[model samples]
Target chain A: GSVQIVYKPVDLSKVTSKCGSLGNIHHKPGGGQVEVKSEKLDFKDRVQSKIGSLDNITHVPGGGNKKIETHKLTF
Target chain B: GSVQIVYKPVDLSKVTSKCGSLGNIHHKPGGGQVEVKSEKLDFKDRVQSKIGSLDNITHVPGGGNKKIETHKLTF
Candidate 1:
């Protein structure tokens, strides 16, 4: 059998907004504006990579089992 | 935008010993290894069979909401 669960993605921008420069803004005249921007992330090859998915299944003893794993990141 | 993260059940003897055993030391060696080995792990072939957990919620533009993502690994 299998199980499925409903999920909702979290807003990264809003999540960061809580701490990013573009935090909350007031109605003041100079409400302190924080411009948000995405810049190229520095890396060894200027290329960013995230280990995505890796799975391995096998049958042993009585039944069988599987192993899956991965990660995500912005380039 | 949808994001999914898959993770495999990492094991020590299963992958060159990182942490320490997967589902406990089902067996051992030299001392009380229990000798008699059942199905020998091909290591390579086992790579095709096994699955962990996979999930990554992603946020998209003009979102009435967010996207849900899931993953599964097995040959």
Candidate 2:
């Protein structure tokens, strides 16, 4: 099976710092600006396995019946 | 990617046990019998993750070019 995942962050925090002779400027969180980022991921891989067992029956010389069971895994 | 792991044992040891009126019997290691079982493991489940970065070019007021680098991860 294959799948695709997407990640998008909406972190719009404030950015404030000192600017030489422009004093200080405070940026507000609005207008969908200053966001983190977005990305997309892809996955394509798959596999499978199986196992089974059969019934083993045996007969006696008298009148009764004997039964044996066996099970195993195959690769 | 998907993978298939197979486990098989070749243990052909002797089998010794006691019987009612038949006394005791010791079987030798032959005919490839009295061995362990085998198994097949299937890995059909998988996923992927990706990350990338692009060149962010910006211009400065001093006639020089300024670059603001940015990077992120997607899942």
- Candidates' C-alpha lDDT: 0.24, 0.26
Model 1 Cα lDDT, one tens digit per residue, A1-75: 543333333322211111111222223112122222234423232232222132122212221223333323222
Each model's backbone clash number: 23, 0
**Which pairs of residues clash in candidate 2, taking residues 3 or more apart in a chain or in different chains?**
none
Stretches off by above 4 angstroms in model 2 are A18-75, B1-67, B72-75
lDDT of 2 by residue, B1-75 (tens): 543433332323222221111222223211111222324423346533321121111222221222232343322
Q: Give candidate 2's root-mean-square deviation (CA, Å).
A: 43.5
Per-model TM values vs. the true structure: 0.13, 0.15
Compute the lDDT of residue B34 as modeled in candidate 1: 16
Report i-RMS for every model: 31.2, 43.5
Give one digit per residue, the lDDT tens place, for model 1 in B1-75. Answer: 443534433223121111211232212111111112123222222122221222122222211222233444432
- Residue A23 shift from truth in candidate 2, angstroms: 11
